[PDB]
């Protein structure tokens, strides 16, 4: 007994996409089926439901843009998504209503798919712009801001990999633009600032870009 | 959206409770509250339905209740494997459903740890590029839940904020970052900006100034 | 009887068809042929419909289940015979035949020989349905969905019930 979603991917704002959810071990034609979505880092949101006679209901956030349907013969549920917006970026799950042996719903969802990711974004391959984060208990923190690149990943080293103690490269933020930024900071002895050189080496293989940025006290 | 605490934590063997506050037209109106457990990268798992009932296979350490507009999940005898995100759900009328925003449950494996915060102002290079980013880097906190607020002088700023979800560091504490994107004129037109980081009810403020 | 047994179309069980009749059969074409009371007339009635192979057991006195309770019920004192045969070649289609239906919900069990063809929305919960399908408000009939590759218990069977009054 399982549900397998497909169809997710990157789509530009305003575009359309159709998700699919194939059932095994029960028939969608005899069950009450929903879609539920989850934005990255955020909570679950119920999207839509379809009853055995075909009657459908929708969250107000998607009404008029999304359509739930099924193909009994393929034992598959669909979600047609039109006029997609940034806010529709999410993992999309299909879910079966939990029922008793008489097929009466309990109000809960017992069987869930693995989810399919939909990203609504106009991002395309782009290398980063890199800026120094100047230093200003005897330790100083300095770093490199790695801004507006796509897709993941970048790699950051310091002094061409000679400098590893005190390095903390933070996970990137995915901005509403669909581009990524991250920062890398090194904590170093304050006594080294006047005379030791700190350079961050940023590599972004998808755009074939590499950047070295010297980070100096201001 | 039903309202859940962002973070709850307890030690192995203790009991904890997660609340879920809705309204008279959802939690208040039906005995149709369900609870879900969600481990990282996995689908939600049904733990409680009809306010109090457990599906077969679900441990009797999990129990549910309701009072007025607030439902609660109690987990007794906390075990490491219970650490996960938990969501309440209610029928909402007219064949619609509503979920809570989710609670991160931490089963404490070390003492709680306050975040270290570092706030960088825009570089002179970025301002030359006609841009300005404030960078608020938050590290070494445990449990892994924080909220970040930005201020211009003493006024709240919402536009131009991008904040990551916390992620586990190699020392099992957590890190997050928050970025405030400004125009150069915005940066120069205020006396100060601040990054305010709240962890377990404790808020620390870091501040930078163009001058 | 060729009108009955060789009818080209059969009824859904919820809308079971009844024909007033006003040892040749006792044939290797049938897979079930069970008599009650009067082992092998004023009036004879031939009732016919389609159910799943594994539901044919429910077309008998004293049986329970969604067919016996909500679709077609025989009395304890039944005197008559129950005849069934596999109709997978006729009543399955590639992609599935969804035209045969059974009643899944009812406020009470049928009485013997009662027929219910209502399409009223079934109120399973506290909120009135007001004619609309939705949460706990169910369209009361459900399609079988007979596919040729189904196991034998899930294949369509045509059933004729002969009653002797
Ligand atoms: C129906 O099927 C065949 C027609 O070729 C016939 O042999 C059989 O006896 C018929 N059944 C009746 C007349 O009850």
């Amino acid at each position: 007994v399982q549900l397998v979603e497909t169809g997710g991917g990157l789509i530009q704002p305003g575009g359309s996409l159709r998700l699919s959810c194939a059932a095994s071990g029960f028939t969608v034609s005899s069950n009450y089926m929903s879609w539920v979505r989850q934005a990255p880092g955020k909570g679950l949101e119920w999207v839509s439901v379809i009853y055995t006679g075909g009657t459908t209901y929708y969250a107000d956030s998607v009404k008029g843009r999304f359509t739930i349907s099924r193909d009994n013969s393929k034992n598959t549920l669909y979600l047609q998504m039109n006029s997609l917006r940034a806010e529709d970026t999410a993992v999309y799950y299909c879910a079966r209503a939990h029922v008793d042996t008489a097929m009466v719903e309990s109000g809960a969802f017992d069987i869930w798919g693995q989810g399919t990711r939909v990203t609504v974004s106009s991002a395309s391959t782009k290398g980063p712009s890199v800026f120094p984060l100047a230093p200003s208990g005897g330790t100083a923190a300095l770093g490199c801001l790695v801004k507006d690149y796509f897709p993941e990943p970048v790699t950051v080293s310091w002094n061409s990999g000679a400098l590893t103690s005190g390095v903390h490269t933070f996970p990137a933020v995915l901005q509403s633009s669909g581009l990524y930024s991250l920062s890398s900071v090194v904590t170093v002895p304050s006594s080294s600032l006047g005379t030791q050189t700190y350079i961050c080496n940023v590599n972004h293989k998808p755009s074939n870009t590499k950047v070295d940025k010297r980070v100096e006290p201001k | 959206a039903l309202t859940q605490p962002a973070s709850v934590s307890g030690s192995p063997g203790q009991s904890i409770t997660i609340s879920c506050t809705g309204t008279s037209s959802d939690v208040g109106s039906y005995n149709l509250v369900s609870w879900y457990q969600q481990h990282p990268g996995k689908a939600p798992k049904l733990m409680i339905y009809e306010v109090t009932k457990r599906p077969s296979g679900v441990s009797n350490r999990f129990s549910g209740s309701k009072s007025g507009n607030t439902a609660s999940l109690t987990i007794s005898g906390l075990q490491a494997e219970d650490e996960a995100d938990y969501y309440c759900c209610s029928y909402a009328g007219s064949s619609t459903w509503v979920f809570g925003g989710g609670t991160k449950l931490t089963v404490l494996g070390q003492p709680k740890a306050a975040p270290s915060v570092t706030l960088f102002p825009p570089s002179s290079e970025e301002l030359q590029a006609n841009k300005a980013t404030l960078v608020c880097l938050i590290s070494d906190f445990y449990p892994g839940a924080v909220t970040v607020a930005w201020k211009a002088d003493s006024s709240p700023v919402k536009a131009g904020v991008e904040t990551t979800t916390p992620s586990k560091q190699s020392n099992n504490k957590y890190a997050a970052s928050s970025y405030l994107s400004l125009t150069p004129e915005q940066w120069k037109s205020h006396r100060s900006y601040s990054c305010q980081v709240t962890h377990e009810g404790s808020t620390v403020e870091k501040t930078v100034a163009p001058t | 009887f060729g009108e009955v047994f060789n009818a080209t179309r059969f009824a859904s069980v919820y809308a079971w068809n009844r024909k007033r009749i006003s040892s040749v059969l006792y044939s290797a074409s049938f897979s079930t042929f069970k008599c009650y009371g009067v082992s092998p007339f004023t009036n004879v009635y031939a009732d016919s419909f389609v159910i799943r192979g594994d539901e044919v057991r429910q077309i008998a006195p004293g049986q329970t289940g969604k067919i016996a309770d909500y679709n077609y019920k025989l009395p304890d004192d039944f005197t008559g015979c129950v005849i069934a045969w596999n109709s997978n070649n006729l009543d399955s289609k590639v992609g599935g035949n969804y035209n045969y239906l059974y009643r899944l919900f009812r406020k009470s069990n049928l009485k013997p020989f009662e027929r219910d063809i209502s399409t009223e929305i079934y109120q399973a919960g506290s909120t009135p349905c007001n004619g609309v399908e939705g949460f706990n408000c169910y369209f009361p009939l459900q399609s079988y969905g007979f596919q040729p590759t189904n196991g034998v218990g899930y294949q369509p069977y045509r059933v004729v019930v002969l009653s002797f009054e």
Side-chain angles (χ1 to χ4, degrees), chain A residues 1-9 11-217, chain B residues 1-55 57-124 126-157 159-187 189-190 192-210, chain C residues 1-2 4-8 10-18 21 27-37 40-41 43 45-56 58-92 94-164:
Chain A
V1 165
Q2 71 177 1
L3 288 167
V4 180
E5 299 92 338
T6 54
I11 184 74
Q12 65 286 342
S16 301
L17 193 62
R18 191 183 77 170
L19 311 179
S20 294
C21 171
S24 311
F26 68 100
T27 47
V28 295
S29 66
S30 67
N31 279 276
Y32 318 105
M33 304 298 303
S34 288
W35 291 92
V36 173
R37 67 184 179 180
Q38 188 172 28
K42 305 330 301 316
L44 297 172
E45 180 185 19
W46 174 85
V47 181
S48 59
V49 62
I50 186 161
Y51 282 86
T52 56
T55 307
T56 54
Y57 300 81
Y58 294 92
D60 290 340
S61 53
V62 305
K63 200 177 279 184
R65 298 185 302 119
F66 293 9
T67 300
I68 186 171
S69 67
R70 61 172 174 254
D71 182 329
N72 296 339
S73 58
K74 312 188 189 277
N75 199 20
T76 294
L77 188 74
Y78 304 96
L79 187 64
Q80 179 66 52
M81 306 184 289
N82 295 323
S83 305
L84 281 161
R85 316 185 273 234
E87 315 88 81
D88 295 316
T89 294
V91 169
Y92 284 72
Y93 292 104
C94 51
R96 186 179 79 181
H98 179 246
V99 295
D100 63 15
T101 56
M103 304 307 296
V104 175
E105 309 157 86
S106 72
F109 304 95
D110 61 348
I111 305 294
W112 295 70
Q114 88 280 358
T116 193
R117 186 83 225 287
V118 167
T119 302
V120 180
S121 148
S122 51
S124 61
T125 307
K126 184 185 174 299
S129 288
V130 183
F131 296 102
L133 297 177
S136 64
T139 73
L142 56 91
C144 273
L145 167 61
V146 181
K147 185 179 169 195
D148 290 335
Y149 63 91
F150 182 88
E152 287 281 25
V154 297
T155 54
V156 182
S157 64
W158 284 88
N159 297 347
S160 309
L163 173 49
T164 47
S165 306
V167 174
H168 185 179
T169 296
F170 285 70
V173 69
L174 170 55
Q175 326 171 219
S176 63
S177 65
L179 308 175
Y180 297 84
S181 295
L182 60 73
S183 300
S184 179
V185 169
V186 58
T187 46
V188 304
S190 291
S191 64
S192 70
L193 292 181
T195 56
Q196 301 197 30
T197 299
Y198 298 105
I199 296 168
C200 70
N201 323 108
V202 180
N203 189 2
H204 184 244
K205 294 292 193 186
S207 68
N208 292 296
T209 308
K210 295 185 176 187
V211 187
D212 290 334
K213 185 66 57 176
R214 186 198 321 274
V215 184
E216 268 163 336
Chain B
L2 309 171
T3 297
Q4 277 180 263
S7 167
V8 165
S9 67
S11 290
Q14 290 178 347
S15 301
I16 56 91
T17 295
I18 301 175
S19 66
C20 168
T21 302
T23 70
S24 56
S25 67
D26 50 52
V27 176
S29 280
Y30 311 102
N31 291 323
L32 296 175
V33 173
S34 51
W35 291 88
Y36 304 82
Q37 189 188 58
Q38 189 183 31
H39 285 100
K42 303 286 182 173
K45 172 184 175 182
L46 181 62
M47 307 297 285
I48 293 286
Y49 63 101
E50 284 174 327
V51 182
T52 64
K53 304 182 179 183
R54 286 180 282 106
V58 169
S59 161
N60 63 9
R61 295 184 301 108
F62 294 80
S63 65
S65 63
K66 175 162 92 99
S67 173
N69 297 318
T70 297
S72 293
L73 179 72
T74 298
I75 304 167
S76 70
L78 274 172
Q79 303 176 3
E81 47 269 36
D82 302 334
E83 173 160 333
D85 293 335
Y86 289 80
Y87 292 91
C88 58
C89 177
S90 183
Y91 188 58
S94 301
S95 302
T96 65
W97 282 261
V98 59
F99 283 94
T103 296
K104 182 177 176 67
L105 169 63
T106 300
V107 181
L108 294 165
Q110 54 177 318
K112 292 188 177 173
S116 291
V117 180
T118 293
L119 174 63
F120 291 102
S123 61
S124 63
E126 189 185 20
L127 291 161
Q128 199 287 331
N130 202 17
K131 299 165 307 152
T133 308
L134 277 39
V135 181
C136 189
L137 302 175
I138 310 161
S139 57
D140 290 332
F141 57 98
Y142 183 79
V146 286
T147 55
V148 182
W150 289 85
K151 265 70 168 134
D153 302 312
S154 37
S155 171
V157 177
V161 175
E162 301 279 350
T163 300
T164 66
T165 66
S167 67
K168 200 173 77 170
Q169 310 175 152
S170 66
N171 67 356
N172 292 319
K173 302 181 181 177
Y174 286 74
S177 41
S178 186
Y179 298 86
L180 173 53
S181 297
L182 302 173
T183 66
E185 168 181 337
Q186 285 164 350
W187 168 239
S189 290
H190 295 273
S192 72
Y193 284 76
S194 306
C195 179
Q196 290 186 347
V197 179
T198 300
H199 180 257
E200 306 288 302
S202 174
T203 298
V204 297
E205 195 189 28
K206 294 282 187 172
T207 292
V208 289
Chain C
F1 281 114
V4 176
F5 287 83
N6 291 336
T8 314
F10 267 51
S12 289
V13 56
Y14 85 87
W16 50 272
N17 183 305
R18 163 113 67 103
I21 289 307
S27 167
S29 298
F30 307 124
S31 47
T32 285
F33 204 124
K34 303 185 203 250
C35 291
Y36 294 83
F41 250 106
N43 311 297
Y45 289 110
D47 304 332
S48 59
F49 48 83
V50 167
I51 49 173
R52 265 160 57 162
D54 54 20
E55 289 169 338
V56 175
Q58 301 192 29
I59 312 300
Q63 297 293 288
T64 189
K66 296 310 92 197
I67 303 306
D69 297 340
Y70 295 166
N71 288 266
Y72 183 85
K73 175 82 207 269
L74 296 174
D76 309 321
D77 57 53
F78 183 58
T79 45
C81 308
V82 177
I83 299 102
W85 62 100
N86 187 295
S87 66
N88 200 38
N89 64 327
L90 300 178
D91 293 321
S92 287
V94 174
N97 182 1
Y98 294 84
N99 295 318
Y100 286 108
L101 322 175
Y102 64 91
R103 185 170 309 280
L104 179 54
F105 300 105
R106 199 174 192 265
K107 290 183 176 178
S108 64
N109 289 347
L110 294 173
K111 293 164 173 87
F113 298 126
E114 191 175 5
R115 183 173 158 169
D116 182 350
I117 64 169
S118 174
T119 58
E120 169 162 326
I121 303 307
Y122 177 80
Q123 185 185 332
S126 42
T127 308
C129 300
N130 296 120
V132 176
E133 169 188 44
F135 179 75
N136 276 358
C137 281
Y138 301 120
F139 194 78
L141 308 178
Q142 167 72 46
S143 56
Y144 275 117
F146 293 117
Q147 321 220 50
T149 66
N150 292 347
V152 57
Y154 296 99
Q155 291 179 12
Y157 277 61
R158 294 186 175 190
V159 180
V160 178
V161 174
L162 301 178
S163 55
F164 305 121

